[PDB]
Amino acid sequence: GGSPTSILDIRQGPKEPFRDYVDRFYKTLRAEQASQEVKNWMTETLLVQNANPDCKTILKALGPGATLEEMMTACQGVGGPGHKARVLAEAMSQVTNTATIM
Amino acid sequence: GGSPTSILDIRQGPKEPFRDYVDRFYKTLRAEQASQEVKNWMTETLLVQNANPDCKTILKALGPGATLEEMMTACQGVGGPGHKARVLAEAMSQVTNTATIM
Amino acid sequence: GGSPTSILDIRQGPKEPFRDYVDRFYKTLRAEQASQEVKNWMTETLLVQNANPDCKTILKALGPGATLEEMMTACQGVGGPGHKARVLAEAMSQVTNTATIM
Amino acid sequence: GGSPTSILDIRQGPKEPFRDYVDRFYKTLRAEQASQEVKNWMTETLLVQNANPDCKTILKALGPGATLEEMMTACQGVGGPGHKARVLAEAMSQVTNTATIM
Amino acid sequence: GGSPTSILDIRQGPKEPFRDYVDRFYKTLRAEQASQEVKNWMTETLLVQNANPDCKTILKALGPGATLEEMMTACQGVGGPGHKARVLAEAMSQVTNTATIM
Amino acid sequence: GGSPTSILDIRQGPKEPFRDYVDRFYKTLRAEQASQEVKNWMTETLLVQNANPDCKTILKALGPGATLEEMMTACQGVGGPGHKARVLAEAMSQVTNTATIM
Ligand SMILES: C=C(C)[C@@H]1CC[C@]2(C(=O)O)CC[C@]3(C)[C@H](CC[C@@H]4[C@@]5(C)CC[C@H](OC(=O)CC(C)(C)C(=O)O)C(C)(C)[C@@H]5CC[C@]43C)[C@@H]12
Numbered sequence: 001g002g003s004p005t006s007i008l009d010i011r012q013g014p015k016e017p018f019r020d021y022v023d024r025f026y027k028t029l030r031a032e033q034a035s036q037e038v039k040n041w042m043t044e045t046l047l048v049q050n051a052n053p054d055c056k057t058i059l060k061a062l063g064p065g066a067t068l069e070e071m072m073t074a075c076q077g078v079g080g081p082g083h084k085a086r087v088l089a090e091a092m093s094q095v096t097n098t099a100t101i102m
Numbered sequence: 103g104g105s106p107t108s109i110l111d112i113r114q115g116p117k118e119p120f121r122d123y124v125d126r127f128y129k130t131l132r133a134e135q136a137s138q139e140v141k142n143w144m145t146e147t148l149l150v151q152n153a154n155p156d157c158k159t160i161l162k163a164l165g166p167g168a169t170l171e172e173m174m175t176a177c178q179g180v181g182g183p184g185h186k187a188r189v190l191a192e193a194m195s196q197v198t199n200t201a202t203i204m
Numbered sequence: 205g206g207s208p209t210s211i212l213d214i215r216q217g218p219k220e221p222f223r224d225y226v227d228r229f230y231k232t233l234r235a236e237q238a239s240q241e242v243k244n245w246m247t248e249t250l251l252v253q254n255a256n257p258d259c260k261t262i263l264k265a266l267g268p269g270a271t272l273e274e275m276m277t278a279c280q281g282v283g284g285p286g287h288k289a290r291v292l293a294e295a296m297s298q299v300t301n302t303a304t305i306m
Numbered sequence: 307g308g309s310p311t312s313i314l315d316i317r318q319g320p321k322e323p324f325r326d327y328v329d330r331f332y333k334t335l336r337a338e339q340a341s342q343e344v345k346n347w348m349t350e351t352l353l354v355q356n357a358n359p360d361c362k363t364i365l366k367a368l369g370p371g372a373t374l375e376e377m378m379t380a381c382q383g384v385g386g387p388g389h390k391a392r393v394l395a396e397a398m399s400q401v402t403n404t405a406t407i408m
Numbered sequence: 409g410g411s412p413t414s415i416l417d418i419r420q421g422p423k424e425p426f427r428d429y430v431d432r433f434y435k436t437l438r439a440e441q442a443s444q445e446v447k448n449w450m451t452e453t454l455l456v457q458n459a460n461p462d463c464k465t466i467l468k469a470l471g472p473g474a475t476l477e478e479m480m481t482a483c484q485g486v487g488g489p490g491h492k493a494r495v496l497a498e499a500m501s502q503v504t505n506t507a508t509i510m
Numbered sequence: 511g512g513s514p515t516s517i518l519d520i521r522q523g524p525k526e527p528f529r530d531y532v533d534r535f536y537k538t539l540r541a542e543q544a545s546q547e548v549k550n551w552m553t554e555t556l557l558v559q560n561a562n563p564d565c566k567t568i569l570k571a572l573g574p575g576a577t578l579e580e581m582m583t584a585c586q587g588v589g590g591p592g593h594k595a596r597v598l599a600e601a602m603s604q605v606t607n608t609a610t611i612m
């Protein structure tokens with residue numbers, strides 16, 4: 001479970017940029033008195049998993065063994081037409097070619 | 103029915119994330135004077151139902167007994183690109199494959 | 205007629221939450237100096253008519269006699285991605301097969 | 307002409323709902339010093355011509371002589387995705403069959 | 409070049425309404441200390457060139473010598489769903505027939 | 511890497527228009543105490559690479575080394591439906607024909 005303030009309740013806003021949410025995660029973490037390792041691996045597992053399925057999955061899309069910067073860039077394209085454009089095109093064709101999903 | 107300020111009146115806004123909604127709900131539940139036995143289940147029954155069909159529908163999808171956490175992670179993903187994007191993936195085949203609905 | 209401050213000037217913004225629109229509907233109505241009988245049916249005839257061509261459309265879909273609980277929620281489906289989502293599914297699947305309308 | 311703050315320079319923000327438009331139209335007309343009768347002949351032609359090419363064209367779409375009630379019925383659904391939707395419903399179905407326009 | 413605060417640095421936000429952009433243009437212009445003749449010709453060459461390729465192109469579309477009122481009327485349709493709508497419709501059919509561009 | 515407040519961290523938000531991004535960038539560049547040569551090229555390497563996948567790739571789209579006016583016009587058009595649309599048409603044309611990508 002994850003209570004307020006605690007990074008365990010820190011989740012990216014679907015509209016919130018990963019560039020922002022990523023920050024909310026680390027600053028909010030400053031709000032928590034977690035052991036540094038408890039705060040870092042948190043910054044790892046809590047960040048990605050709580051990073052707005054869009055960014056969060058993008059992180060996975062980015063191929064694990066990622067750098068915070070990359071997912072920052074891929075998940076940064078989220079919020080502006082970069083998303084509403086690329087995702088739109090991708091979903092637009094996610095189904096065009098892959099419509100049969102099982 | 104559900105009068106204002108009561109958890110019964112509590113409802114995830116059409117765009118309100120499961121995360122935010124789950125916050126005003128429980129706070130509202132604090133605002134309500136139902137025992138924990140009456141509140142905790144309101145937290146169960148009212149939450150899923152009042153939680154905005156986007157979340158509410160996911161909620162039923164995850165599978166009865168979905169950890170509040172699971173819906174807490176999925177339902178919340180809704181909002182900006184969260185619903186614009188992911189759903190575009192399903193909205194896209196919702197008409198292409200499922201255009202005929204009966 | 206229907207000048208401002210009356211329930212005859214109570215409309216749901218297109219993106220407006222039904223729960224919101226309907227909220228001002230009745231506060232305005234409270235201000236509207238009609239009899240219980242002249243105020244209450246407004247709730248019915250003006251709510252459906254002035255409620256966002258989409259919610260207005262939904263209400264008919266909800267099947268008259270419906271408790272405001274259902275129209276409020278279906279209409280609650282409006283605003284967030286839910287509105288674009290449900291509509292995208294029907295209008296998109298309407299313009300595909302039903303593109304021919306006479 | 308039409309200088310700022312005069313009903314003449316009163317124009318529905320592209321997105322400014324007609325409801326917002328008609329309220330601000332009436333907020334700047336009321337503000338505008340045109341005879342009581344002039345305001346009446348302003349409230350007529352300026353209202354339809356300045357109300358956002360969408361709410362406006364709608365006012366013209368309802369067929370001149372459209373009770374201000376009908377505009378409010380149609381140009382009220384403007385702004386939300388209900389518009390992006392209802393508009394798409396026709397524009398989307400207008401391009402498929404009517405793409406060739408001369 | 410065009411330094412900050414100058415009308416040379418004044419550009420319509422990609423989403424910024426022409427009505428808006430044109431307002432700050434002239435407000436900012438006053439800030440710029442250009443001779444009346446210099447401000448008047450900036451008002452013309454900088455207004456169109458720095459007016460958001462949507463409006464900026466519209467202005468040209470309106471055809472040179474276009475009255476500020478026409479740019480204001482055509483570039484005002486830019487911003488909300490009024491645009492996304494009109495533009496999507498043309499772009500949509502542009503790619504249908506005109507997809508081949510050379 | 512690029513720490514907080516540095517022009518290195520500095521990035522065109524997804525909604526931050528290039529004309530604005532470039533505005534906080536330069537203000538933020540002044541904030542980081544660097545030599546002229548340093549700021550001279552920071553303004554370059556950090557302005558295009560941190561430049562919002564849309565504006566940034568636009569710069570590269572225009573052709574790197576592009577005049578600030580070329581990236582500015584091109585990126586000052588990135589923000590609203592002038593963009594969310596111009597792109598929707600193209601990305602749409604990217605997945606219609608070019609959906610197959612390898
Ligand atoms: C690919 C598809 C399957 C379909 C096939 C063709 C299509 C159709 O007929 O369905 C043409 C219309 C489009 C392109 C939809 C896709 C969806 C989009 C969208 C609903 C997408 C989300 C966008 O909003 C944002 O990005 C958020 C934003 C408003 C900028 C903010 O921050 O406030 C908005 C602008 C609302 C559009 C309007 C155009 C349409 C309907 C297309």
Ligand SMILES: O=P(O)(O)O[C@H]1[C@H](OP(=O)(O)O)[C@@H](OP(=O)(O)O)[C@H](OP(=O)(O)O)[C@@H](OP(=O)(O)O)[C@H]1OP(=O)(O)O
Nearest residue numbers: 015016079080081182219321423487488489524525589590
């Ligand atoms: O007017 P608000 O209630 O504050 O809503 C705004 C508005 O969106 P709409 O087009 O739906 O009216 C913004 O647009 P502008 O007012 O600047 O035109 C938009 O941002 P964009 O300009 O980037 O499209 C932003 O949406 P978001 O930041 O989610 O993309 C959204 O704010 P909220 O939904 O957060 O209220």
